[PDB]
Amino acid sequence: MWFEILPGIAVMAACLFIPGMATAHIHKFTNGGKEKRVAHFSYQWNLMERDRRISGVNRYHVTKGLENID
Amino acid sequence: MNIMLTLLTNVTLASLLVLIAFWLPQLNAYSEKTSPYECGFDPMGSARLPFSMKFFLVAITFLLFDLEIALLLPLPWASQTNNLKTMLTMALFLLILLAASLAYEWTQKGLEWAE
Amino acid sequence: TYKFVNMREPSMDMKSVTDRAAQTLLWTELVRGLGMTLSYLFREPATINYPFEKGPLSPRFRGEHALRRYPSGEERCIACKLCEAVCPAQAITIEAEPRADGSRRTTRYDIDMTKCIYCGFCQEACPVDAIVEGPNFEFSTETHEELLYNKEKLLNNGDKWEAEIAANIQADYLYR
Amino acid sequence: SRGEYVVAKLDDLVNWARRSSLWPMTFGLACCAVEMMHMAAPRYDMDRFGVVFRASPRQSDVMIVAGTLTNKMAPALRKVYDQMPEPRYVVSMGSCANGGGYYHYSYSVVRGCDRIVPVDIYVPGCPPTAEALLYGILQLQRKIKREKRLRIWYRR
Amino acid sequence: HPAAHGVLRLVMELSGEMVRKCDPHIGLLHRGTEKLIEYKTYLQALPYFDRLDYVSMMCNEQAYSLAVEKLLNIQPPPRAQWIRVLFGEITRLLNHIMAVTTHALDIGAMTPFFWMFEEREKMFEFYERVSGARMHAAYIRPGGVHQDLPLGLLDDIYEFSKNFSFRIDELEEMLTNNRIWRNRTVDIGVVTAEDALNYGFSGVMLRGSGIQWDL
Amino acid sequence: FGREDRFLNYFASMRWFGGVPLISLGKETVKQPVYIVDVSKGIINAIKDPDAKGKTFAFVGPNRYLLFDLVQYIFAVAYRPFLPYPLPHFAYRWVGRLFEVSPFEPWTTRDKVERVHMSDMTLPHLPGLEDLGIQATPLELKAIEVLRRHRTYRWLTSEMEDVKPAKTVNI
Amino acid sequence: ELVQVLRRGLQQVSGHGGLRGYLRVLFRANDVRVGTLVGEDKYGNKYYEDNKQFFGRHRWVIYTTEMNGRDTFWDVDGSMVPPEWHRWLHCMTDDP
Amino acid sequence: MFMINILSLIIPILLAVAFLTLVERKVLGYMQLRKGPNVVGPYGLLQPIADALKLFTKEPLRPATSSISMFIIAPILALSLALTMWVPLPMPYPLINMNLGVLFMLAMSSLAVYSILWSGWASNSKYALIGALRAVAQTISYEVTLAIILLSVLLMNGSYTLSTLITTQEHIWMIFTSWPLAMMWFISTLAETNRAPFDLTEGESELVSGFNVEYAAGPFAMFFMAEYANIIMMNAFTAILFLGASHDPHTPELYTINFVLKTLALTITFLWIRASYPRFRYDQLMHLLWKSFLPLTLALCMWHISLPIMTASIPPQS
Ligand SMILES: CCCCCCCCCCCCCCCCC[C@@H](O)O[C@H](CO[C@H](O)CCCCCCCCCCCCCCC)COP(=O)(O)OCC[N+](C)(C)C
Ligand SMILES: CCCCCCCC/C=C\CCCCCCCC(=O)O[C@H](COC(=O)CCCCCCC/C=C/CCCCCCCC)COP(=O)(O)OCCN
Ligand SMILES: COC1=C(OC)C(=O)C(CC=C(C)C)=C(C)C1=O
Ligand code: SF4
Ligand code: SF4
Ligand code: SF4
C-alpha cells in the first residue's frame, strides 16, 4: 504494497503546491514585497489612487512617510 | 481585464488541444467506421425521435424554486439592518411559504414520476 | 429441511427505534462498508510478477503436443491410428506404410492445433506412449499456418521437451 | 543522418506510448471470456501492465475474440471492429476463434475469426490459460515495439 | 454490451427509460452441439457438456454420465460417487461466486468480484490438479471418474474450505445491509409461485418465491 | 473511380474551399472513367485468356462526360452546393506548385492539375473490356457507393435513383 | 517498528550489489526482492526462491540479457526457460 | 507578469489531474487486492504520460450523423470551464479577487452542465441522448439544495468573498458549527461531479459509455481532464469552506501546504467512496435530494438565519 501508492500522491501534492506559492511570490514581486492591496469598496480604491498620485513614480506601493512632510 | 485575459487563455488552450488532436494523427475514415454505435447492430429508429420525460412536473417546480434562491441570497446583507425583527419575520415568512409549497407538491403525488 | 432467509421482524421498542433512526440519519452501515474497503487497502495483494513468476501447475497439465522416442532413438509410434479414431475434434491425420527396414511407421502425422480441444484423449488411447500433451503453454504465433503441426514439428517438440515429459510421466503413470 | 536519428527516436516514443497503453474492448463470446476475466482477476492483474477494459469501441485499441464466432454473430463482430479508430489490433483467443475448434464442422460456425477480420496474435488452447493470454498480450506488445512507421515514411 | 452477459441481443421498447417491452434475441452462440453429438461416440461426446455451461462443468459431466449409466444399467463405485458430489459442490461454489459477483458488478459494485475471483483461482487449481485442465476437465465419465485423486489434494481442499466462510462474510458485509443495494434489489423482479411453476422456472428462481423444492 | 479512388473523392473534397476552380469552367475536357471492379475483372480475364499474350488493351467506361457536368453530378450526388468558377491555367499551376511542398501526400500537384484538365484519348484500334467478356459498369450505378460518405446527416438516406444522371457527350 | 521496515529496505538495496544493480533489477523486473539463488542456466537465467512469501511469489527467475541470438535486456518472455527449470518454476516438482 | 501567473496556475493543475488518474487506479487496485499500474515507469509514474501520448496520437472520429459544430464545442467548453473555476480560490491569495466569488462558482458550475448536454445531443446516438437526459435530471435534483446549503453556511461568514472564510475560521473549523449541512454538501458535491454512486451520465454497465460514447482520442481525453479537474476543484472548495486553514501573512506557504493536504484527503475519500458502493438509480437520487435533503436544508436555513440574531453573533462587513 500500500505504500507504493505514495509516489503518485507526492507528485500530485507537489503539482498542487505550485499555484499558491506562485501567486504569493508574484503578488509580492509586483507590489514592493508587501502583500498586494485589496480594494473591495470605493474607499480603498480612493486610498490607492491617492497613494499613486502622491508617490511621484506613478506606483501606489511606493510609500512616503514623515520625511516627505519636512 | 484580468478575468477577460484568463478566459481567453483557457479557451485558447482548449482550442489548441482540439487542433492538435485533429491534425496530428493519421486519419482513415470510411462509412462503416463513422456509423452510429448500437452494440454492433444497426439502430431501428433515429436518435432525434421524441424521448419521454417522466419528471416534467419536477422540472417546472425546479423552475419555480430557483427564484426563491435569488430571493434568499441577499440575506447576509439583510442581517445587518437596524430593524432586525421585521427582517427575521420576512425571511421566516418566505422560507415557510417555500416549505408549504414543497409540502403541497409532495402530498398530491407531484413528486412521483409518471409510469 | 429448509430455512427462511428474509423472515425476521424488527424490534419496536424506543431503544431500537432510536437506534434505527440514528442509523438512517448518520449512515452507519455505509461507514461499515467504507471500513471494510479500508481494511482491504492494507492487505498484501495476490498479484504475482509475471513473467518472472509463474502460476502453479501439476504433472497432469495438458499443453502442447509432442511425439516421443524409445531410449534407443527409435520412434514409439506404430501407426495404429487409435488416437486418430478417438480424437473428438478430428484434429489428427495419419498416413503410414512399411519402412525400408520393414518397420511399421507413419509417413504423415499432422495435428491441427486450431481444431484441437486439448482433452488428452489421444494420450489415453495411445498404447505405447508415443503421443503426449506436454507442459508447454506459451506457444502463441503470429500467423494461423504456424499452428498446423506436421510430423517434423511434433518430433522436434518431443526432442525439445523430453527432459520434462519423461519426468512428468514418471510422477503420474501409477495413477493410470 | 540526423533526420534518420530523429525519426527513429520519434518512432520509438510513439511505439512505447501505444504498447504501454493498450485498452481492449469489453467484449467476450464464450468460455474463453472466463479466462479473460481471470486475467483481469487480482492474481494476474493485467491493469498493472497498463491494460484497461473499455466498453465503447471508440475508446478501444485491441479486440480480443474470446469464444466461438457464429454466422449470426459475425456481422456484429465486424461492425464493432470497424468502429475502432486506428491503430487497432485483434487477438484471437482459443481454438474456436482460431480455426473453429470443437465446432469446426458445424453449419453455423465461422471457421476462424480471420475470415472476418485480420488477426495479429493467435493464442492456442481450449481455453488458453490466463497466463497464456498474458503471454499473447506481451507478444503483441513486443510486435508493436517492432513497427517502423516514421522510418518507412522517411524512406519514401 | 458489458451487462449483456455474453452474446445477447435484447431488443427493448422503452417509453423514456421505462421498459415497455423486452424481446431477447439469442442464437449468437448456437454451434449446433446436438447434431455434432449425433456424429460422435458416447465417450467422444462428453467434452461438449463441459462447454455447454462453462461455469458449471463437472455438473454437466455428471448429468450426462448419469444418463449414460442409466441407459447402460451399470453402477459406479462408491468412491467415484463421493468424488462426484464433492466436485459438484466445488463447482456450485464457483458458479455462485460468478453469479453474485457479476450481478453486483452490473449493479455498480466492483470490489467483491476481485475479492472472490482469487477463490475462483484456487478452485481452478483444484480442477487442474485432479484433471490437468483448469476448467474443461472431462473428469466425470459414465464409468465413474477418469483418474484417482492425487495424494495431497484433500488437505488443500480442507485448507480452502476452512477459510472460505470469512470471504462469504466479507461479501455479505459489503452488500447485504447496504441501503443502496437494497434500493436496487428489493421488490425488483417479483414473480409469483404459480407463475414461476407455469413458466418452467427451476432452482433458486423457484425457491425465491417460497416453493420448497430441490432435486 | 471507386471507394478509395482519387477521382471522385478528389472532386468531392473540393467543397472545403467553398468554390470549385475549373480551368475554362471545365467546358473543354472530356472524361471516360472506368469502375475498379471492371478493371480487376479484366486483369483476371487477361491472365486467364491465352490469346491475350502480346495484346494491348484500353479499359474505359461506357460514357464520356464533360468535366463540368461530371463535377456537377458529383456534387449533386453528395448533396453539396455547387459553386464553380473559372480559374486561369497559370493561376491553377501556381496553386498546384504551392500544394506540392507538402512532405506528406499532397492535396493536389501541378501534374494532377494537368491530368485533370486534359481530355481522354480515343483508341478504337485497341481491344477493350468487351473483348475480355466484361460489360463496363456505368458511373450512374456506382457513384452513390462512393459519394454517400460525403453527404451530411440530412441527406444520408437518399436513394440511388434520386439524383438524375447527367448528360454524356457520346458520338 | 517503522525503523525495522526502513532498514529492511536499505538491506534490500544493498543485497542487489549497490544502487546500480538495484536500479537494474527495478527497471528490468519491476521487483527489488532478494531471494536465495537456486541455480544458473547455461543461457544465463538465474533462479531464486524465498519460502517466506506466499504461494506463487516464492519462486522466480531473472532472465539473461542475451540468449541464442537476440538482446533480451528489455525483451523477455516465459518461453525462455529450459524444460528442467520449466518443471521446477511452475511448481510441478519440488526438486531443482 | 499576470500571464505567468495564469500559466503557473493552469499547467500544474493539468499535471495533478494526469497523476490523479494513476492515483485513482492504484487506490482502487489495492482496495481490490491487486496492485494497479506498476510496470511502465517506476511504480507506474510514467503511466499518465503514456496514456496522454497514446490518446493524442490516435485517430479522432467524426460521426456521420453527428452535429459537428457542437460536437467540437462541447469538450472545449468543458475544459475551459474546469480551468476557469480555479481562479477565485484563495490559496491563501486568489488569482482573481472577487466580491462575490461563491456566486461566480455557482454560475460557472451550472454552466458546465451544457458541455455534457450538447455533447450527448450532438453525438446523435441513443446512449448519448440517455446520458444527456440523465444529466438534466441530476442537475434538477441537486441545484436548489446546493444553493441553500451554501447560503446557510455563508450566513456566518458575512459576505460571499472567499477570502473572508479564512478569517471566519481563524479559531475553529466551520465543520464544528454546521456538520449536518456539511454532510449534505458533501453528498451534493458527489452528485455535482457525476461521481459514484451518482455516476449516471456515464453509466458504464447501463449505457456503455453514456454521453461520450461516440467520442475518441483527444476529445475524449479532454472530457476526462475536465472531469478530474472538477473533482479536485470541488474538494478544494469543500476544504476551504469547512476546514479553514490558519494563515500567517508573512508565511503563506504553511497555509498552502495545509490546504493542499486537506484537498488531497478529500479527493482520496472520493476515490474510496467510488470503490466502496454500488450505483444509484437516477430517480432515487431525485427522491433522496427532494424528500430528505430539501426539508432538512430549509429547516437548517431557518435555524442559521435565527441563530446569529438570537445570540448577537452577526458577522461584520455589511
Ligand atoms: C512536451 C509535451 C509534448 C511531448 C510529451 C513527451 C512526454 C515525455 C516522454 C516520456 C519518455 C518515457 C519513455 C521511455 C520509458 C521506457 C522504459 C524502458 O523500459 O523502455 C525500453 C526502451 O524504450 C523504448 O525503446 C524507447 C522509449 C523512448 C524513445 C526515445 C525518447 C524520445 C524523447 C523525445 C521527447 C520529444 C517529444 C516530442 C516533441 C515535439 C523498452 O522496455 P519495455 O518494453 O518498455 O519494458 C519491458 C517490460 N519489462 C521490463 C517488465 C520486461
Ligand atoms: C441545539 C440546536 C441544534 C438543532 C438541531 C441540529 C441537529 C441535527 C440532527 C440531524 C442531522 C442529520 C443530518 C443528516 C443529513 C441527511 C441524511 C439522510 O437522512 O439521508 C438518508 C440517505 O442519505 C444517504 O444515505 C447518502 C447516500 C450517499 C452515500 C455516499 C457516501 C456516504 C458518505 C460517506 C461519509 C461522508 C462524510 C460527510 C462529511 C464530509 C466532510 C465535508 C436518508 O435516506 P434513506 O435512508 O434512503 O430513507 C429515506 C426515506 N425515509
Ligand atoms: C459467465 O457469463 C458471461 C458473462 O457474464 C459474466 C459475460 O459478461 C461474458 C462477456 C462479457 C465480458 C467482456 C467477458 C461472457 C462471454 C459470459 O459468458
Ligand atoms: S487432445 Fe483431444 S482434441 Fe487434441 S489431438 Fe488429442 S484427442 Fe484430439
Ligand atoms: S501416436 Fe500412439 S495411438 Fe497414435 S498412431 Fe502412433 S502409436 Fe497409435
Ligand atoms: S476454445 Fe474451448 S474454451 Fe474457448 S470458447 Fe471455444 S470451446 Fe470454449
JSON list of C-alpha atoms and ligand atoms in Angstrom, two decimals, chain D residues 25-31 33-34 36-37 53 66, chain E residues 1-2 4-7 54-55 98 102, ligand 3:
[
{"chain": "D", "resi": 25, "resn": "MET", "atom": "CA", "xyz": [-12.83, -3.71, -25.82]},
{"chain": "D", "resi": 26, "resn": "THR", "atom": "CA", "xyz": [-15.15, -5.10, -23.16]},
{"chain": "D", "resi": 27, "resn": "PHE", "atom": "CA", "xyz": [-16.07, -7.97, -25.46]},
{"chain": "D", "resi": 28, "resn": "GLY", "atom": "CA", "xyz": [-16.44, -11.71, -24.92]},
{"chain": "D", "resi": 29, "resn": "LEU", "atom": "CA", "xyz": [-18.29, -14.57, -26.57]},
{"chain": "D", "resi": 30, "resn": "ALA", "atom": "CA", "xyz": [-17.94, -17.90, -24.74]},
{"chain": "D", "resi": 31, "resn": "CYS", "atom": "CA", "xyz": [-15.87, -19.94, -22.25]},
{"chain": "D", "resi": 33, "resn": "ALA", "atom": "CA", "xyz": [-14.07, -14.86, -21.73]},
{"chain": "D", "resi": 34, "resn": "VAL", "atom": "CA", "xyz": [-13.99, -16.50, -18.29]},
{"chain": "D", "resi": 36, "resn": "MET", "atom": "CA", "xyz": [-10.11, -13.30, -19.82]},
{"chain": "D", "resi": 37, "resn": "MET", "atom": "CA", "xyz": [-11.86, -12.37, -16.56]},
{"chain": "D", "resi": 53, "resn": "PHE", "atom": "CA", "xyz": [-11.09, -2.69, -20.44]},
{"chain": "D", "resi": 66, "resn": "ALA", "atom": "CA", "xyz": [-12.75, -14.84, -26.79]},
{"chain": "E", "resi": 1, "resn": "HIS", "atom": "CA", "xyz": [-22.64, -4.63, -24.04]},
{"chain": "E", "resi": 2, "resn": "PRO", "atom": "CA", "xyz": [-20.94, -5.02, -20.64]},
{"chain": "E", "resi": 4, "resn": "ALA", "atom": "CA", "xyz": [-25.42, -8.46, -21.71]},
{"chain": "E", "resi": 5, "resn": "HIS", "atom": "CA", "xyz": [-23.68, -11.47, -20.07]},
{"chain": "E", "resi": 6, "resn": "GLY", "atom": "CA", "xyz": [-22.14, -12.52, -23.37]},
{"chain": "E", "resi": 7, "resn": "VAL", "atom": "CA", "xyz": [-23.95, -12.73, -26.71]},
{"chain": "E", "resi": 54, "resn": "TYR", "atom": "CA", "xyz": [-18.78, -23.22, -18.99]},
{"chain": "E", "resi": 55, "resn": "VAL", "atom": "CA", "xyz": [-19.30, -22.09, -15.39]},
{"chain": "E", "resi": 98, "resn": "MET", "atom": "CA", "xyz": [-19.57, -15.88, -10.51]},
{"chain": "E", "resi": 102, "resn": "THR", "atom": "CA", "xyz": [-21.10, -10.32, -11.68]},
{"chain": "I", "resi": 3, "resn": "LIG", "atom": "C1", "xyz": [-20.34, -16.10, -17.49]},
{"chain": "I", "resi": 3, "resn": "LIG", "atom": "O1", "xyz": [-21.26, -15.43, -18.31]},
{"chain": "I", "resi": 3, "resn": "LIG", "atom": "C2", "xyz": [-20.70, -14.45, -19.13]},
{"chain": "I", "resi": 3, "resn": "LIG", "atom": "C3", "xyz": [-20.71, -13.19, -18.76]},
{"chain": "I", "resi": 3, "resn": "LIG", "atom": "O2", "xyz": [-21.29, -12.84, -17.54]},
{"chain": "I", "resi": 3, "resn": "LIG", "atom": "C4", "xyz": [-20.37, -12.59, -16.52]},
{"chain": "I", "resi": 3, "resn": "LIG", "atom": "C5", "xyz": [-20.09, -12.11, -19.66]},
{"chain": "I", "resi": 3, "resn": "LIG", "atom": "O3", "xyz": [-20.13, -10.99, -19.28]},
{"chain": "I", "resi": 3, "resn": "LIG", "atom": "C6", "xyz": [-19.45, -12.50, -21.00]},
{"chain": "I", "resi": 3, "resn": "LIG", "atom": "C7", "xyz": [-18.81, -11.50, -21.97]},
{"chain": "I", "resi": 3, "resn": "LIG", "atom": "C8", "xyz": [-18.56, -10.10, -21.42]},
{"chain": "I", "resi": 3, "resn": "LIG", "atom": "C9", "xyz": [-17.13, -9.82, -20.95]},
{"chain": "I", "resi": 3, "resn": "LIG", "atom": "C10", "xyz": [-16.45, -8.72, -21.75]},
{"chain": "I", "resi": 3, "resn": "LIG", "atom": "C11", "xyz": [-16.25, -11.06, -20.83]},
{"chain": "I", "resi": 3, "resn": "LIG", "atom": "C12", "xyz": [-19.46, -13.77, -21.35]},
{"chain": "I", "resi": 3, "resn": "LIG", "atom": "C13", "xyz": [-18.84, -14.21, -22.68]},
{"chain": "I", "resi": 3, "resn": "LIG", "atom": "C14", "xyz": [-20.07, -14.84, -20.46]},
{"chain": "I", "resi": 3, "resn": "LIG", "atom": "O4", "xyz": [-20.06, -15.97, -20.80]}
]
